[PDB]
Amino acid sequence: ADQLTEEQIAEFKEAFSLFAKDGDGTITTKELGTVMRSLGQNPTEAELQDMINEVAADGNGTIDFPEFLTMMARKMKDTDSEEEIREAFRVFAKDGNGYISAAELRHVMTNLGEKLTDEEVDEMIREAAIDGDGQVNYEEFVQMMTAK
Incomplete structure (x- = not known):
């Protein structure tokens, strides 16, 4: 809530x-x-x-x-797209190790939001770093949807 x-x-x-x-x-x-x-x-x-x-x-x-x-x-x-993300990530952010891959989010945040683009992701990615593993988590990325 x-x-x-x-x-x-x-x-x-x-x-x-x-x-x-x-x-x-x-x-x-x-x-x-x-x-x-x-x-x-x-x-x-x-x-x-x-x-x-x-x-x-x-x-x-x-x-x-x-x-x-x-x-x-x-x-x-x-009309809240942020209430839907917590719901979607359960479909894309659990493909193994538990941390969603950098390529899925753009398909996730975009899956819930019609206006929300990939630049929304690339904007939050800079903070995620992504490098080293190439993927990211749910508590660090989507959490930036609740913060930003």
């Missing part, structure tokens, strides 16, 4: 609360993304009804603030 800042939430209440209700302190869907569009993100048109249905469901007719943000990261987990 990835950690998040508590001050961005101060950004999360800036919007939700602008639409804040008198009851449990909830809001609707059309204007909730205005909470999602504020941090530098944006939600889908059909998901506001379903994922919000996971937190705005209980029989109120709207969305509350507490769990609406907890699910917010699941949405950034919907």
Whole structure:
């Protein structure tokens, strides 16, 4: 699981609360993304009804603030390529000795990321050294995906 800042939430209440209700302190869907569009993100048109249905469901007719943000990261987990790498390397980074070969990563990071290129690899390679064995590991390389 990835950690998040508590001050961005101060950004999360800036919007939700602008639409804040008198009851449990909830809001609707059309204007909730205005909470999602504020941090530098944006939600889908059909998901506001379903994922919000996971937190705005209980029989109120709207969305509350507490769990609406907890699910917010699941949405950034919907467009997160870094959450997929940990998953892929189990297919390419275990061909023997346990350290993935320098030639697989470019096929791995590229396998998860559509925008992410080989230059992403060659950029992290310089730090990996690669020379001597010609290959690299998972804890040293992909770990640079979590750091960079």
